[PDB]
Every structure is written in structure tokens, then in C-alpha cells.
């Protein structure tokens, strides 16, 4: 108690003390020249992480798990980069991913050595290893968007630290050296391609994107040794020629215009369509051709006539039907030809395409040669059973090739046959094709759905092509409209009308063939969804009064963590304390009338001579109605159990701000009227508020309270702040209900108990607002911001500020600063920041909010982040279920095992694919909640912005989930991207079909 990190300091089992970690940080900072006011920031960050993990496990397990998560495990990003770009082991990882189905100098040897080295480190060494990465991540500015560049930098610095060069140096490195010598040149490269210097200003230059290098094109250079080998100093010498321990010292001479290039280019859109989705045209067009040729004898029948009913030879039916194979082969060849014009020629993985072409031609040949033999006139005139057996054989060869090219993905067709030493894959398997597999009942459900859809569709399409088209084809193709025509051309425009009509008929049927599979998809999903309700046991027929009567027991079992508490009270005295809280919260919002409340509360009015009559259940159990109904309804679905609020982890709520209105001005209140509009729109609230005015009461106070009342009904930031500060009071209520010994022992000192409750609720929840224009508000906006800091003392605000240049006629200096409500007032009228961190320039290069969140992201704390926006709202009864929502990431109630144990193997591990996103509802999903360690080590929380984050998390190897008992109160270019190129050409067939028919 009265200590900052009680779960680590107040314990006697801690392997490393606080005063032994502070000097580790100080030593690194002296040696490599970081900034002091960032070293302090990251020391705070690290300590809060240790506290959060050690409150539900042992301290040593906490340190070990953090080390596994950041540097040394199979859930680390640094290990993946190290194995791909240093040990050159991409193809083996691809093979292992392919053969995991049967699995459950060599990859096993390298993994054995890595585990052996990581199993014998002292705790001091683990603290040093984690600290260096965090220190580097704290300065990296815009290089935070590019993770593998950061991994390269960290590796170089670590190689320098352990050298005899560093440990014999006397004087320290001058401060600010890391940012001046290493980080600024990369930022200069990045900016020098969207802007240009004209007459002393930066003006955006216009040029085609095929000549602009973005974040991804930098990021991808550090995925191969071949890219690492291109980095050149000013002498013309290569970087990788130097011994390992000297490369960090020179990392300021590297010239980045001669290095970075473009890695993926755009073209006309139909080419993208043809390449990304080939598996669907192969399976529609070929079968249509089969069906149409079998039922259409007239075109290959000698002296065809229905009157004589003569049919052609069966050899001709089979040889005609057997062109589906050549059609499928031709489609695949065209797809590869279109793909060859997306990627640079010499970049790694582009030789594979060439080989893929050769094999394809071979298949084309074997599937066209034999048919010609049947259609050669040598065997035309002589009937043989040889022709019949040939046609019969080629029919099934054609069926086989249609199925084969409909199932297997394009990237990864003939990888197992080359057995070559060079690159076997077009794109990196570590960072692009690491999908998380399915397990259990849903895996079979996915197979069954698609089998059913396609069986129904094909059997139904045949029977509506057989009759709607057999007679028109036979008639329009054989009639003779004998006429002279127009002799300028001839009769060639009067014998050809029926056949032009026939071509148009067939074309419309061909187009209609594509619209039927969508219908069957919809129908089969709706039937399966209805059928699964019975297994899920969904009861909508039950009366509304049959949910409200079961509400109390659900509250007792699912909202409270009663199991841990020693049973000393009746369940009524626990449920009373929650029910009354909800009701009074609604009442005070001017949302219920005085006489409505008394109908609902638990009452103590009965006599106190008998303790049993003190409490009586409400009459209810024997806008407001909508809220209570949804609360009770959502409680019926299964909910995971909670932890005591002394074991729950830390989390942050992050908000952006630009141009929105904090509070309503008086001009907009008295002029045009808004007040009359609102009163006509919310009349009963207006009369309740005026009743409240006469209850308590120029009149400045009336002015301010009217302003507040009007702001709590419109698009204001104060509405959102006041809504989302309900988490604090929820945590205080839960903490005080769960354990009454504290409330007893304090014994009337309400003030001391208030300090205790606030102190606990302060270390579990953080609020962060990012304003990028606080430096240049006009005075009334500044007045509003100061008012907010006065109403809620614990709120935090981050902003940007500027200083004049050190030397005349140069660039001004730029800093990122933090304040809250406990900083004192300067005589200038401003507040002193807690932290100021210097940047390498203006951080806003592209439009959007992504750059807004990137600069304030270094000030977050905890393990989980909630991303909200400027206009959003929340309620107490919803905020009361945060523990159950957070337990959805599958980390709170699991046992702990040593990651580096000699006996374990990769296939036995159960921690391979973590959960990255959880989205709420009333693989697409807007990310409400975010796993911060997973996300912040592989690029930002957002990117230049929401669906792309979900697709990147999926490609990297995470999982996305949906929660059905939480609500969020929110109220063309895609098809040319890399993400579609990677998803379309590498997913297995059933997942691909599910992805295609949604978006």
C-alpha cells in the first residue's frame, strides 16, 4: 500500500528489485545516447507491465512470459525476422505449415539451439534485453510503422553493446545521438517523396503512385538477405562487409535513395479481377461448356435433321464434351500471363512464375493432342472401338483437370516437384501465408455447406438448361429465310437474322448461369442458421416477464465474482447493491420521474425490530425500458466468469480530436433557434430539468448549467467523456461490494475509504485524449479545455508544440507533450507537462487519423486498448461487464509452462495463434478491443484504415472473434491492393469461397 507497483515491490519473491532495474536503464542510456525524458517514460511503461502481469501469477513467471512475448518465443516477431532474414529458413517454414496436418542445417536443429541459448539467461539479462527494445521503440517516430526495419536496428545495436569496443570507452556518448544520427535520415527520405521545397516552403508534388515508395515498400526490403545485401556506404563499400560489431557505428553514412525501390504495381482493374479470382471462372465456364455441347448435336451432326432423327456418333458427343479441359488450361495460362506484370523481374520469387508457365503448357498439350486424333479424318471414315475408348478416356481426364484446377490455389501449384535450391514461392510464407487453421465442428460445417450449395446448383442448372434451350437451338439453327438481301453486300444480311438471334439467346443464358449460385448460397445459409437454433436452444416464445423474473439469479452468478468470496451474506444483500445502483444512475440523468423510481427500488421502509422484513423484493420482479430489456436479454446467453477486481489487468481508452466542438457557445444557444428545436424534440427532459432548477435554485451559474444541459444532447466531446467515465464508478462499486471487511474496518471515516477506492480504481483504467491543435486554440477553446481538466482531474491530454531553431534560418524543433489534471499552473497560464519528447520533424505527412494516433501511442499503459471515436456513448449497466469481455482473449485463466523447456516440440505447443481483435455486435469486423503487445510489435494500431488492420492481423497469424453480449454506441480502391492479391491466390478452397461470397 502507498506504493506505486504493489504486485511487484511489496512481494518478497521478486527476483530483481526496482533499484536494480533503474540503473540498468540508466547504463544503457549513458552508453548509446538516448534522451532522458524518454528513458523516464519507458521505465514507467515497463514497470506497469510487470505489475499487471504479476497480480494473477508469480513474479518470475511474469518476467519469463514477457521475455517470451517480446524477444524469444514462437509468439515473437523478432524470432520470425531472425529465422527468415539471417538463417535463411523461409521454405522450410512453408513446408512445415503445409504438412502440419500430418505432423500433429535443419529447422529442428536451429530451434533446438535457440531454445538452448535462451534457457540459461539470468533475470538481469532478461531485463536488459527487454529494456533495449522498448528504448528503441520509444524514439522511432515514423519508423514505428515499419517493424522489420526496427528489428534490424535493434540487432545492430545489441551486437555493438557486447563488443570490446564499447566496454573500454571512457567518455559517454553525447545526448540525442540516436535520433540525430540514425532516425532522421530515414524520415527525410520518406518526406522527400510527397513534398518538395519551393520558395522556402514544403508543397506537395503530384506524381503517379507507381513512382512513390510507401511504408510497405521500405518494410519489405528487410525480409531477405538479398535486400540486406544492397545497403551501401558513401565509400561505395557494402554494409555487410564490415565485421558485425562495427556496423552500428557507421549506420549514419548509408544513403537511402540508392537503396529503396518499388515492390508491387497497379494496372487496369480487369486484369486484377482475372488474376485474383481464377478458381471461380474455371469452375463456372468449363461446366457451362460441357452442358451446352452435350445437348446441342446440330453443330457437329452430318446431315442433321429432326425429321430423320439421326444422331451423330457417340464418339462425337464425348470428343465434343472433352474440351472443358482445354478451356480450364487456357484460363490458367491467361491468369499467369496477367500476374507476370505486377512484380519486378529480379526481385526474389519471380523465377518461380517462369517454371509455372512451362508445366502449364505441358498439361495443355496432353489435353489437346488426343482429341485431334479423334477429329482427324483418318479415324473419321473408319468406325473403330479405338475411337470410342479414346473419347471415353479423355472425358475423365477432362473431368480430373477441371476438379484439380478448381481446388488447388495458384501460388503453390507445383512447389513439391522443383526441389530446387532457389526460391520456391512468389511471396514470403512467414509474413504472408500464415493463416490460423480451424478446429472442431465448424471445420466440418464449412465443408458441408459448400458441398450442399454446389450439388444443388449443378443438378438444378442442368434441368433448366435442358428444356428452355433444346427446341430454340434446333429450330433457329436450321430454318432458311431465303431472300435476295442487299446486293451492296448481298443476301448475307437476310439469311443471318435467325442465327444472330440464337447467339443473343445463348449469351443471355450464359450470363444468367452466374446468378444462381448466389441464390443457393443465401438459401442454404438461412436453413442452416434456422436449424442450429434448436441446438443453441434459443427461446423467443418465452414471455418478456419470464426473463425479468430470472434476472436476479443471473446477476448473482454472472456479474459478481461470488465464487471466491467466503459465503457470509444472503444473495439479496448482494443483488440489492447492484440493482439500486443501476436505477439511481438512470434517475439522475433526468431520465426518470420522481414517482417512477419508488416503484422499482428495493425498500427498507418495513420495520427494523425484525431484521428479515428490512429488505423486500421490488414489484418489477413480481429509452429506459429499451436499456433494461436489452440488459436482461443479453444476460441469458452464456457469459464467462470474472476475476476479483484485484486480479484484473490494466487497460486504456484512446480518443482522437480535431475540429470538433467541446462545448456549445452562447451565440449558438441564443441565436439561429436551437433551444426551441431541442425542447420541441425532447420536451419531457426539458420539463424535468426546469423542475430540477426550481428544486435547487446575469445568473452565470444558470448560464453554465443550461450550457451543460444543451451539450449533453448534441454532437459534443463532453458528452462522450462523461459517458465513458462510467468505468471508474463501475470498478469502485464492484470492489466495494465484493469484500466488506475493508468497509467495516474503516468504520465511519468516509474520506479514507474514498481515497482507498479511488486509488485502486486509478491503476486499472486510463483515459487518453489526443488533441493536435491545443497549441493554437483561440482563448474560448482554451477555456473549454481547462474546464474539462477541472471536471475530471484524472483525464490525460497529449499535444504537439514547437520551438525556434537553434541556428538562424533553419528548421524549427518539434516536441510531443503530455499533461493531466494534477500538473500545477504556470504563471504564463499554461500547465507544465509531465513528459516532452523530441521528434525529427512534423509528423503529419498524410491526411487521416493514423498519424494522429501514432504520436500519442507512446503514452498508453496496460495490456489492452479500446479504440473509440469523437461521437460515442456508454452506460453503467454495459460498463459493468468489462471483466467478462476482457476474458475473451484467452489469457486470464490458463496455466503457465516454461517456453524454453527441452522436451517440448512445435506441434505440442498450444499457444501458437493468439487472439488479436475482439469486435462487438448489436472475417470482417471493426476492431473495438485490441491486444496491445501483439499489435504494437507488428506495425501500428491503424494504417494509411480499419479493414486493412484486420486483414494484416489475419495474414500475420492472429484470430478475430465476436462478442454477442456487448454493444458499441456508434452513430473500388480495395480491389487494386496487395491484401487481395495475397488472400485470393493462397487460401485453401473453402476459406476462399467463404471470403469471396461475402465481400
Amino acid at each position: 500500500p502507498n506504493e506505486p507497483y504493489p504486485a511487484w515491490t511489496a512481494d518478497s519473491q521478486s527476483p530483481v528489485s526496482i533499484e536494480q532495474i533503474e540503473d540498468i536503464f540508466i547504463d544503457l542510456t549513458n552508453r548509446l545516447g538516448f534522451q532522458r525524458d524518454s528513458m523516464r517514460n519507458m521505465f514507467d511503461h515497463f514497470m506497469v507491465l510487470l505489475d499487471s502481469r504479476s497480480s494473477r501469477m508469480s513474479p518470475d513467471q511474469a518476467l519469463l512470459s514477457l521475455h517470451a512475448d517480446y524477444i524469444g518465443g514462437d509468439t515473437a516477431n523478432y524470432k520470425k525476422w531472425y529465422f527468415a532474414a539471417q538463417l535463411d529458413m523461409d521454405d522450410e517454414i512453408g513446408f512445415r505449415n503445409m504438412s502440419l496436418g500430418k505432423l500433429s542445417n535443419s529447422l529442428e536443429a536451429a530451434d533446438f539451439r535457440w531454445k538452448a541459448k535462451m534457457n540459461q539467461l539470468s533475470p538481469l539479462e532478461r531485463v536488459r534485453h527487454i529494456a533495449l527494445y522498448l528504448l528503441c521503440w520509444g524514439e522511432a517516430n515514423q519508423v514505428r510503422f515499419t517493424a522489420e526495419c526496427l528489428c534490424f536496428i535493434y540487432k545492430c545495436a545489441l551486437d555493438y553493446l557486447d563488443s570490446p569496443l564499447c566496454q573500454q570507452r571512457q567518455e559517454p556518448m553525447p545526448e540525442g545521438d540516436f535520433l540525430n544520427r540514425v532516425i532522421t535520415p530515414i524520415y527525410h527520405f520518406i518526406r522527400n517523396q510527397v513534398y518538395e521545397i519551393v520558395d522556402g516552403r514544403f508543397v506537395k508534388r503530384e506524381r503517379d503512385h507507381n513512382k512513390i515508395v510507401g511504408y510497405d515498400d521500405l518494410n519489405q526490403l528487410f525480409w531477405y538477405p538479398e535486400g540486406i545485401a544492397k545497403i551501401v556506404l558513401e565509400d561505395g563499400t557494402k554494409l555487410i562487409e564490415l565485421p558485425l560489431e562495427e556496423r552500428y557505428l557507421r549506420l549514419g553514412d548509408v544513403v537511402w535513395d540508392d537503396v529503396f525501390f518499388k515492390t508491387y504495381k497497379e494496372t487496369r482493374t480487369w486484369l486484377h479481377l482475372v488474376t485474383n479470382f481464377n478458381r471461380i471462372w474455371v469452375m463456372h465456364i468449363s461446366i457451362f461448356w460441357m452442358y451446352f455441347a452435350y445437348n446441342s448435336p446440330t453443330f457437329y451432326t452430318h446431315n442433321y435433321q429432326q425429321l430423320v432423327d439421326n444422331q451423330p456418333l457417340a464418339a462425337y458427343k464425348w470428343a465434343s464434351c472433352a474440351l472443358g479441359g482445354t478451356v480450364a488450361s487456357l484460363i490458367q495460362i491467361v491468369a499467369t500471363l496477367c500476374e507476370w506484370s505486377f512484380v519486378p523481374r529480379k526481385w526474389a520469387g519471380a523465377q518461380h512464375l517462369s517454371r509455372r508457365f512451362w508445366f502449364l503448357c505441358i498439361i495443355f498439350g496432353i489435353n489437346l493432342g488426343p482429341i485431334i486424333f479423334v477429329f482427324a479424318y483418318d479415324k473419321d471414315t473408319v468406325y473403330s472401338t479405338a475411337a470410342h475408348v479414346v473419347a471415353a478416356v479423355m472425358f475423365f481426364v477432362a473431368v480430373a483437370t477441371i476438379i484439380f484446377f478448381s481446388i488447388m490455389p495458384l501460388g503453390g501449384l507445383f512447389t513439391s516437384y522443383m526441389k530446387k535450391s532457389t526460391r520456391r514461392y512468389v511471396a514470403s510464407q512467414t509474413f504472408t501465408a500464415a493463416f490460423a487453421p480451424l478446429h472442431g465442428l465448424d471445420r466440418w460445417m464449412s465443408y458441408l455447406v459448400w458441398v450442399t450449395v454446389f450439388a444443388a446448383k449443378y443438378s438444378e442448372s442442368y434441368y433448366f438448361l435442358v428444356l428452355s434451350l433444346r427446341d430454340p437451338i434446333r429450330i433457329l439453327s436450321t430454318t432458311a429465310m431465303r431472300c435476295t438481301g442487299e446486293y451492296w453486300w448481298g443476301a448475307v444480311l437476310c439469311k443471318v437474322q435467325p442465327k444472330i438471334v440464337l447467339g443473343l439467346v445463348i449469351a443471355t443464358d450464359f450470363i444468367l448461369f452466374f446468378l444462381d449460385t448466389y441464390l443457393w448460397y443465401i438459401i442454404v445459409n438461412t436453413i442452416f442458421s434456422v436449424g442450429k437454433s434448436f441446438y443453441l436452444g434459443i427461446s423467443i416464445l418465452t414471455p418478456w416477464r419470464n426473463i425479468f423474473t430470472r434476472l436476479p439469479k443471473r446477476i448473482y452468478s454472472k456479474i459478481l465474482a461470488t465464487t471466491d468470496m467466503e459465503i457470509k451474506y444472503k444473495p439479496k444483500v448482494l443483488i440489492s447493491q447492484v440493482w439500486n445502483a443501476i436505477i439511481i444512475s438512470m434517475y439522475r440523468e433526468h431520465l426518470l420521474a420522481i414517482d417512477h423510481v419508488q416503484k422499482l427500488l428495493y425498500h427498507q421502509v418495513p420495520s427494523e425490530i425484525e431484521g428479515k422484513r428490512t429488505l423486500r423484493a421490488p414489484t418489477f420482479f413480481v429509452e429506459a425500458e429499451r436499456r433494461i430489456s436489452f440488459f436482461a436479454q443479453s444476460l441469458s446467453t452464456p457469459i464467462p466468469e470474472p476475476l476479483p477486481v484485484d486480479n484484473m489487468p490494466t487497460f486504456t481508452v484512446l480518443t482522437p480530436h480535431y475540429a470538433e466542438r467541446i462545448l456549445l457557445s452562447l451565440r449558438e444557444i441564443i441565436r439561429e433557434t436551437l433551444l426551441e428545436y431541442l425542447k420541441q424534440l425532447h420536451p419531457v427532459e426539458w420539463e424535468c430539468f426546469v423542475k430540477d432548477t426550481k428544486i435547487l435554485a446575469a445568473a452565470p451559474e444558470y448560464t453554465l448549467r443550461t450550457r451543460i444541459w444543451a451539450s449533453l444532447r448534441s454532437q459534443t466531446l463532453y458528452r462522450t467523456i462523461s459517458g465513458f467515465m462510467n468505468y471508474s464508478r463501475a470498478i469502485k462499486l464492484l470492489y466495494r461490494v465484493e469484500n466488506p471487511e475493508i468497509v467495516q474496518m474503516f468504520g465511519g471515516n468516509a474520506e479514507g475509504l474514498e481515497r482507498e477506492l479511488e486509488k485502486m480504481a486509478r491503476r486499472k483504467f486510463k483515459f487518453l485524449v489526443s488533441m493536435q491543435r491545443l497549441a493554437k486554440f483561440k482563448p474560448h477553446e482554451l477555456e473549454n479545455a481547462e474546464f474539462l481538466l477541472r471536471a475530471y482531474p484524472d483525464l490525460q491530454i497529449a499535444y504537439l508544440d514547437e520551438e525556434p531553431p537553434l541556428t538562424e534560418g533553419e528548421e524549427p524543433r518539434i516536441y510531443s507533450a503530455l499533461i493531466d489534471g494534477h500538473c500545477e499552473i504556470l504563471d504564463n497560464g499554461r500547465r507544465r507537462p509531465k513528459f516532452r519528447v523530441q521528434l525529427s520533424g512534423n509528423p503529419i505527412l498524410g491526411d487521416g487519423k493514423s498519424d494522429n494516433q501514432n504520436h500519442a501511442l507512446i503514452f498508453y499503459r496496460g495490456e489492452y486498448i479500446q479504440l473509440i471515436d469523437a461521437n460515442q456513448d456508454n452506460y453503467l449497466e454495459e460498463c459493468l461487464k468489462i471483466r467478462s469481455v476482457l476474458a475473451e482473449f484467452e489469457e486470464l485463466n490458463v496455466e503457465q509452462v516454461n517456453p524454453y523447456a527441452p522436451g517440448l516440440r512445435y506441434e505440442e505447443q498450444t499457444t501458437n495463434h493468439p487472439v488479436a481483435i475482439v469486435g462487438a455486435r448489436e472475417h470482417y469486423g471493426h476492431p473495438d478491443f485490441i491486444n496491445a503487445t501483439f499489435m504494437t510489435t507488428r506495425g501500428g494500431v491503424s494504417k494509411a484504415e480499419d479493414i486493412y488492420a484486420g486483414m494484416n492481423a489475419m495474414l500475420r497469424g492472429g484470430r478475430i472473434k465476436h462478442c454477442e453480449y456487448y454493444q458499441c454506441g456508434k452513430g473500388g480502391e480495395q480491389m487494386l491492393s496487395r491484401e487481395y492479391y495475397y488472400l485470393g491466390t493462397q487460401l485453401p478452397v473453402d476459406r476462399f469461397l467463404t471470403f469471396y461470397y461475402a465481400h
Binding site: P4, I18, E19, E22, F25, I26, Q35, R36, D37, M39, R40, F43, D44, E175, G176, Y815, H822, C823, E824, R832, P833, K834, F835, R836, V837, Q838
Partner: peptide
Amino acid sequence: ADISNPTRARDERPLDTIRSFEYAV
């Protein structure tokens, strides 16, 4: 006087700063 933050001394260690923040409340 510190370089990035003029209002703080140079020699002030991180734990001194956390103690100061604690006393500010």
C-alpha cells in the same frame, strides 16, 4: 537544467521523478 524539458534539473533520477509525481497528488 534539462535539455528537452527546461523546468527539470539534469541529475534527477527516474525514481525521484516518480516520488515527485506521487507527492503532486
